[PDB]
Amino acid sequence: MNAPIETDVLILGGGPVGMALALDLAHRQVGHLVVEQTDGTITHPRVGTIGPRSMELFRRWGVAKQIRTAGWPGDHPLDAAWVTRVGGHEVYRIPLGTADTRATPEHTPEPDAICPQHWLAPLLAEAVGERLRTRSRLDSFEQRDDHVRATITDLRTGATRAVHARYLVACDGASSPTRKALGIDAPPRHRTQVFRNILFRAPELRSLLGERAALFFFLMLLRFPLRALDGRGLYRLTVGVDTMDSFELVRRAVAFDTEIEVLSDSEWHLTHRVADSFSAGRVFLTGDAAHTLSPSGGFGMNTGIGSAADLGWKLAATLRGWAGPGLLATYEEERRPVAITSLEEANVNLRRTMDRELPPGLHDDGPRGERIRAAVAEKLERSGARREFDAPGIHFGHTYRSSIVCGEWRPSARPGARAPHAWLTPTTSTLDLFGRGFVLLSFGTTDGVEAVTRAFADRHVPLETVTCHAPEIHALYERAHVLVRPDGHVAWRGDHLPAELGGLVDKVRGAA
């Protein structure tokens, strides 16, 4: 006869986002538990590209190294190429080097990475440990005044147990049963696109392609993308449906006569949706459950991870007791607008490919087809197609303009924006200073800092003060004092600390 289990945060869903939230909560020493209905095994990778901002967060949570050393070949091309057929005529290619050779980015200590879900999942599961309960399905929940009660069914054995948690964070996906149960709607913002995904293994295809290999192959037969999943034989063909045999589809897209074994052929319905509300009482929505966006630019999962990181610190602060009563509401305040708009940027990338048409003689071998291909190439570059593969602003430019920020692409320390990266040492970035409590960076004068420290202490708001004597970084941040939030974003800056510190403290913690 087992009794109710107690934990501060119960995370519903062990997908990438739910795991990201668990990592942040562990990093902040908040008791939590993750319940995942499946056994946690991946049979058909849905994600693989990890944006630089997400990698910075994985760096913070201590798993960035293993993600990078998970198995993506250091010498595999990262290029994006528009081709009339893989192995056939090439139309346009965006060179992106290789993991081992590309220049270290100047704006971030962590460039993007490739980690197919079948590697990421075990890796995330390993980092979350025993707090991840697989084959566990949350059947129902009931909110009470100071906690939420959930009934969990052990799908391995068959026994049902109850979990009493202070907060339930639903990371249960795009069709979020939890969102429905809360009576919150997520009205479509664009027509539902139905995609057919064919996961196949072609052991010798990379050898046949060689340097002509690519991470992304945008075919133009009739038009769709083919991806190198693990850079080791596993590929994924994505074709829009709006019906040939799975094997015959791949065969048509690949001009080579090589071993091709289709492993999976499932369907995917993408419906750009954003919840009208990101929470009800003590129940929260994160990831696709809160906002489903288009995968263009890997924008979807990266936004979920960023939203998970935002809710993580606001939850910790409230559980700790130093947060104002209105801090948790700022999760929706700051993250929904990121979805409401940012879901549009992904859509633009989808539209550009959905609208591109193909002319006659594009497959020809004569100098004519080579000329018409060069024609489409020019158009492609003009339509800004290389923007879906290079948009730092999209990964790092989101600036919060909220009730807890004191308002006043290139890295900027303006209030609301991500505090910029700069190397302290060859291994330590300004980013490595953020992630715990608030951080006050002072460039030069330390006059007035003791006042800030006391103001934060009077409210029990964690604050770490750092004096920096580096002009290059001071120039970068543009002000003498910069107050950074637990999430790495600037809450306030200025050459002179404000007069009413109590006001500042109550505002940034969501008490004002």
Ligand X SMILES: O=C1NCc2c1c1c3ccccc3[nH]c1c1[nH]c3ccccc3c21
**Does residue 506 contact residue 512 with C-beta atoms inside 8 Å?**
yes
Query: Quick one: 38 or 453, whose CB is closer to ligand FAD?
Result: 38
In the beta sheet, which residues pair with residue 110?
none
Query: Quick one: 395 or 398, whose CB is closer to ligand X?
Result: 395
For residue 35, state whether it binds ligand FAD (rule: CB under 6 A): yes
Binding mask 213-252 for ligand FAD (x = CB under 6 A): ----------------------------------------
For residue 486, state whether it binds ligand FAD (rule: CB under 6 A): no
**Does residue 70 contact residue 123 with C-beta atoms inside 8 Å?**
yes
Alpha-carbon span 67 to 31, nearest angstrom: 25
Residue from 5, 31, 42, 46 binding ligand FAD (CB under 6 A): 46
Residue from 8, 10, 11, 18 binding ligand FAD (CB under 6 A): 18
Residue 494: what residue type?
Answer: G
User: Mapping DSSP to helix (H, G, I), strand (E, B) and coil, where does residue 139 land?
Assistant: strand
For residue 435, state whether it binds ligand FAD (rule: CB under 6 A): no
Query: Quick one: 37 or 318, whose CB is closer to ligand FAD?
Result: 37
The torsion angle over the Cα atoms of residues 75, 77, 78 and 82, rounded to 10 degrees, is -170
For residue 39, say whether it is annotated as part of any ligand binding site: no
The torsion angle over the Cα atoms of residues 373, 374, 380 and 385, rounded to 10 degrees, is 100
For residue 13, state whether it binds ligand FAD (rule: CB under 6 A): yes
Alpha helices of 88-233 — where are they, by DSSP H? 117-128, 177-181, 205-209
For residue 48, say whether it is annotated as part of any ligand binding site: yes
Q: How is residue 20 written in tokens?
A: 């990201």
DSSP secondary structure letters along 228-265: ESSSSSEEEEEEE-----HHHHHHHHB-S----EEEEE
Alpha-carbon span 64 to 53, nearest angstrom: 11
Alpha-carbon span 500 to 428, nearest angstrom: 33
For residue 268, state whether it binds ligand FAD (rule: CB under 6 A): yes
Residue from 77, 231, 297, 300 binding ligand FAD (CB under 6 A): 300
| Binding site partner of 353, from ligand X, ligand FAD, none, Cβ cut-off 5-8 A by kind | ligand X
* Shortest distance, position 295 Cβ to ligand FAD, whole Å: 3
Q: Which residue has the tokens 């664009």?
A: 190
Stretch that binds ligand FAD, among 182-190, 300-308, 406-414, 424-432 (CB under 6 A): 300-308
For residue 171, state whether it binds ligand FAD (rule: CB under 6 A): yes
**Does residue 291 contact residue 342 with C-beta atoms inside 8 Å?**
no
Stretch that binds ligand FAD, among 108-116, 141-149, 283-291, 488-496 (CB under 6 A): 283-291
| Binding site partner of 268, from ligand X, ligand FAD, none, Cβ cut-off 5-8 A by kind | ligand FAD
- The binding site for ligand X (CB under 6 A) comprises 49, 225, 238, 295-298, 350, 353, 388
Q: How is residue 267 written in tokens?
A: 């369907």
**Could you give phi then psi for residue 194, rounded to 5 degrees?**
-105, 125
Binding residues for ligand FAD, rule: CB under 6 A, are: 12-18, 35-38, 46-47, 137-138, 171-174, 197, 266, 268, 287-289, 295, 300-301, 304
Q: Which residues are annotated as a binding site?
A: 17, 36-37, 46, 48-49, 138, 236, 268, 288, 301-302
Q: Which residues are annotated as a binding site for FAD?
A: 17, 36-37, 46, 48-49, 138, 236, 268, 288, 301-302
